Amino acid sequence: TCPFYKKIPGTGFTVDAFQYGVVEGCTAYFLTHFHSDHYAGLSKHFTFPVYCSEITGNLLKNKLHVQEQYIHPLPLDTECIVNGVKVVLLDANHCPGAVMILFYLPNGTVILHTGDFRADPSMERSLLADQKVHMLYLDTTYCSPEYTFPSQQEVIRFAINTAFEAVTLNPHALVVCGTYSIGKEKVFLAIADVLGSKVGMSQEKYKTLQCLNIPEINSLITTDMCSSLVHLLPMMQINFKGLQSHLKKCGGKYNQILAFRPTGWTHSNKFTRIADVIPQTKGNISIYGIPYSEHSSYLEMKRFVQWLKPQKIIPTVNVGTWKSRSTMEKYFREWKLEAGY
Ligand code: NI
Numbered sequence: 001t002c003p004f005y006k007k008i009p010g011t012g013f014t015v016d017a018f019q020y021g022v023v024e025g026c027t028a029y030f031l032t033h034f035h036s037d038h039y040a041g042l043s044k045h046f047t048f049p050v051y052c053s054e055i056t057g058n059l060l061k062n063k064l065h066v067q068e069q070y071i072h073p074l075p076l077d078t079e080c081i082v083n084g085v086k087v088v089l090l091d092a093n094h095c096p097g098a099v100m101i102l103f104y105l106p107n108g109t110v111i112l113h114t115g116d117f118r119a120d121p122s123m124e125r126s127l128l129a130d131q132k133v134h135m136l137y138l139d140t141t142y143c144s145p146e147y148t149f150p151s152q153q154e155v156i157r158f159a160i161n162t163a164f165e166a167v168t169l170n171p172h173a174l175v176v177c178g179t180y181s182i183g184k185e186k187v188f189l190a191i192a193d194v195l196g197s198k199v200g201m202s203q204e205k206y207k208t209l210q211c212l213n214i215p216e217i218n219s220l221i222t223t224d225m226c227s228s229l230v231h232l233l234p235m236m237q238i239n240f241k242g243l244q245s246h247l248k249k250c251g252g253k254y255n256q257i258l259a260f261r262p263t264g265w266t267h268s269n270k271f272t273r274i275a276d277v278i279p280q281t282k283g284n285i286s287i288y289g290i291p292y293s294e295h296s297s298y299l300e301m302k303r304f305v306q307w308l309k310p311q312k313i314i315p316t317v318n319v320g321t322w323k324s325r326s327t328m329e330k331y332f333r334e335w336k337l338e339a340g341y
Helices: 054-062 121-125 152-169 185-195 203-210 240-249 298-308 322-339
Strands: 013-015 028-030 050-053 071-074 080-082 085-091 099-104 110-113 135-138 173-179 230-234 256-263 280-282 285-291 312-315
Touching (some): 050 054, 054 071, 121 298, 152 173, 152 185, 152 256, 152 285, 173 240, 185 256, 240 256, 298 322, 312 322
Parallel strands (some): 013 028, 028 050, 050 071, 110 135, 135 312, 173 230
Antiparallel strands (some): 280 285
16 A cells, blocks of 8 residues: 555645555656656556656656556646646756656645755755745655765766776776666766767667667667677676676677776765775776765755755655664754754
8 A cells, every 4th residue: 555655645646656556546646757666566557647757758658668648748847737736847866857846735835755866056046946845755865974975076087087097008998887777877978988989788778778868869879789898788797707708798809897886875985985996806807886876965965955944854765664764853853953944
């Protein structure tokens, strides 16, 4: 059965609630983004209206084969009326097509659902600036002060400089980047751009990227692996065994692999600086873990919430343990006492 934190009170609406069968009273199912924990349950046999961004709707049609008549794409930054209630979709700074949803309830209550997001000061000059928010349904993935990581720009500068150095030293080195979902495309696009290459990948991944409305994409990617010196592989193949196997397949074109694993936060963040990160190496293979996050750090989260000043917070992540829930409630009260709302 559907948990309360996926329901929008005073409406017929649910958010990211596709794995519960028919939810009683739900007239429109919102999907914030195309990540499997959030779309879990959707298939080609789903027969209720789904409301989402254009990019998410492209993925629903081409990858999940949801039929067109049930997909309702909405433009961003635009007041829309759904089932008699005003909504706005805002960019979540997560993966391609990811949104936050503002609901303007008939009784005057305003609710923001962040979906998954990476809070940013630019959000303080969206349509959120214009009115008060009573209830915040919040992506609390990294809601504890130990969760620190660099900006996305610092992490990409590290990856560009590492790849450009290695390949300039050895023109016969291949670069490989792991992937298992949409998001984090800047990692492999930025490296291919510094190396003057397209990015090579499987037909299935090419198909997915062709749904994302990325400008000039046809100039940036390919299914011809032979022509490319940056390859994408499934994240599960980013280990010494998988990479050896891949180098075999390249027919002696290359004699070295430099590989990147974009992770979220890892405990090595509590000690090391990005500048100081080193790889794991075995022979002619090296593997870098790089902390490229598409969720808020603790500090980014706290700044957003202290700016927005909501009357009530409903967490949407880490809700399964009493210890997690108590920790998050303590920080919410700190933030509120510190800022005075
Ligand atoms: Ni996500």
